Write an enzyme that holds these catalytic residues in place. Structure first.
Site, short mmCIF file in Angstrom:
data_model
loop_
_atom_site.label_atom_id
_atom_site.label_comp_id
_atom_site.label_asym_id
_atom_site.label_seq_id
_atom_site.Cartn_x
_atom_site.Cartn_y
_atom_site.Cartn_z
N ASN A 129 0.85 -1.21 0.00
CA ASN A 129 0.00 0.00 0.00
C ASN A 129 0.88 1.25 0.00
OD1 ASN A 129 -2.57 1.16 0.09
ND2 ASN A 129 -2.69 1.16 2.34
N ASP B 59 6.19 -4.22 2.59
CA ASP B 59 4.82 -3.82 3.05
C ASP B 59 3.87 -5.02 2.90
OD1 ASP B 59 2.01 -2.15 2.37
OD2 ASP B 59 3.23 -1.14 3.86
N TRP B 60 2.63 -4.81 2.46
CA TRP B 60 1.66 -5.91 2.33
C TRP B 60 2.12 -7.01 1.36
CZ3 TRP B 60 -2.06 -7.54 5.36
CH2 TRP B 60 -2.62 -6.63 6.30
N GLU C 59 10.69 -4.25 5.58
CA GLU C 59 9.59 -3.43 6.07
C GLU C 59 8.29 -4.24 6.02
OE1 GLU C 59 9.07 -0.19 7.39
OE2 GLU C 59 11.09 -0.59 8.12
CL CL Z 1 -1.69 -0.33 5.32
#
Ligand code: CL
Ligand code: CL
Lengths: 301, 301
Positions: free
Chosen positions: A30, A95-96, A119
């Site tokens: 995201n 991230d995701w 991350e």
């Molecule tokens: Cl998020």
């Protein structure tokens, strides 16, 4: 940019490298897209068939009428993998993207040639596990991070911030990059999201973050995926920035040393979106690592 | 740091964990461990990095010896013994590569892997020194041959290398694309305050295996090259455009002909690739070591 039909919609993707080289799947999160890998792909393409999809609802992918839950992304990515005929791959994720990678590895360990990550998302039992850090000078930053994400997860407030004001794209994204992006570098991050409606997947994601047991399905799935990661023996490469955001330098060191066959690469000054500050370093690291693994563990009439 | 070696001493730089795999960084003419200064910190997180100054170079001792290739072999072997290094990755450039090939030839189980660039090879004719088929490069190639012929000529080489300090003041910056800051250039000068101190710098070009002479070195390096051709440990070859001793075309063909030799094409660069590509080299090597290490080996009656 290529396009794969997926579950009655489509996922856009970038592709480079020789068709007979090992596949590397690059997974953004995201509110980014395969655009975040643009300066990394050319460094890895000499050694691998690089495929970088835009998650459904992101980048140039289709915008179907779904909730865009984590499990939606899982299903669309699995359909993309099948559509592209990929039978195994290295995974590179942020991230995701990391959650998708960990969940894929938990279900299909034989698929995973190696996992390079940064991350990343983990279950967070308390809010102090979001942007976890014990460093005194980082405490105000960590509190501010927690405050904004608590707001994103609040009914009404999240909508105003993310759907109306587009705060994830306009503020959170640049807020996680040390340098200032050029206007032409920033534009493709904005173009997927011209309207409140179009921003639905961006609001969905922070509401999927596994914090204090909720949402329970994501929380448990990520617990299970992290247990699988902890027991895994495939090659792993963790990147760490200073101070980073979801992954502190202290935590990265401890987390990496605790896994089996995980190297820790130190990028230097960096926040959440490490790809934008360290494209060259990440690209060269990944290319060398794949070359090393393939060296030892790899047309005529 | 400093190690007593054979009645003299060799200076060295060191970083990384004492229980990590050893990586030996080997410089050549007219450099020292200084050339690795921006590469070492990039490899330190995955390996115990040791970068010696060859005898008579950098901050090492200056004994009254001939500083022939076989002298350097003797002192490097004794350095390895004094440090208690039992196996290592090697990272090398220039004469460092000849030392590396010769080490690997005599001790085939010592070498964990070899990362190399701008290497020395037996050169049957002068046309094999700065070999290139590219028309735009012919005049540069001939000019390199002309100066090295002079370095190798008794009387002439002395005036150029000892008196005028041409190898340090001209050849070195002549092999770097960018212009070194005064602070970067200074540690290259300080080992060589006097004509007598430059003896090792003059000795090296006279050791180059060209047109079968000097025949003792020529034969040793032929045997080292045969052993390299048949070797099975992982290898990583860096190339620049156009490079100097190694052309892009030669590198690509040479790498494909070896067992487990990956190639990384760095971009604009001459002989001293480290100074123009420190980040690219350090990140690549660190990743490559991590990859190889990641795939090392993991109910009965
Ligand atoms: Cl998020
Ligand atoms: Cl020389």
């Amino acid at each position: 940019i290529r396009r794969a039909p997926v579950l009655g919609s489509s996922m856009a993707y970038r592709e480079t490298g020789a068709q007979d080289a090992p596949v590397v799947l690059f997974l953004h999160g995201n509110p980014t897209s395969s655009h975040i890998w643009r300066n990394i792909l050319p460094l890895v393409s000499p050694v691998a068939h690089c495929i970088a999809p835009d998650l459904i609802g992101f980048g140039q992918s289709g915008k179907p009428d779904i909730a865009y839950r984590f499990f939606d992304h899982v299903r669309y990515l699995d359909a993309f993998i099948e559509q592209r005929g990929v039978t195994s791959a290295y995974l590179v994720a942020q991230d995701w993207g990391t959650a998708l990678a960990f969940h894929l590895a938990a279900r299909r360990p034989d698929f995973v040639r190696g996992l390079a990550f940064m991350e990343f998302i983990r279950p967070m039992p308390t809010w102090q596990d979001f942007h976890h850090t014990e460093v005194a000078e980082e405490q105000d930053h960590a509190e501010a991070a927690r405050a904004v994400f608590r707001k994103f997860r609040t009914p009404g407030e999240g909508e105003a911030m993310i759907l109306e004001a587009n705060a994830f794209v306009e503020r959170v994204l640049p807020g996680g990059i040390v340098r200032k992006l050029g206007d032409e570098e920033m534009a493709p991050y904005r173009t997927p999201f011209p309207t409140p409606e179009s921003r639905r997947p961006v609001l969905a994601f922070p509401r999927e973050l596994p914090i204090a047991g909720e949402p329970a399905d994501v929380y448990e799935a990520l617990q299970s995926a992290h247990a699988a990661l902890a027991a895994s023996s495939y090659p792993k490469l963790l990147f760490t920035g200073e101070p980073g955001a979801l992954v502190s330098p202290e935590f990265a060191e401890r987390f990496a040393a605790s896994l089996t066959r995980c190297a820790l690469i130190r990028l230097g000054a960096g926040l959440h979106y490490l790809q934008e500050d360290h494209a060259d370093a990440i690209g060269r690291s990944v290319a060398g690592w794949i070359a090393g693994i393939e060296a030892v563990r790899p047309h005529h009439h």
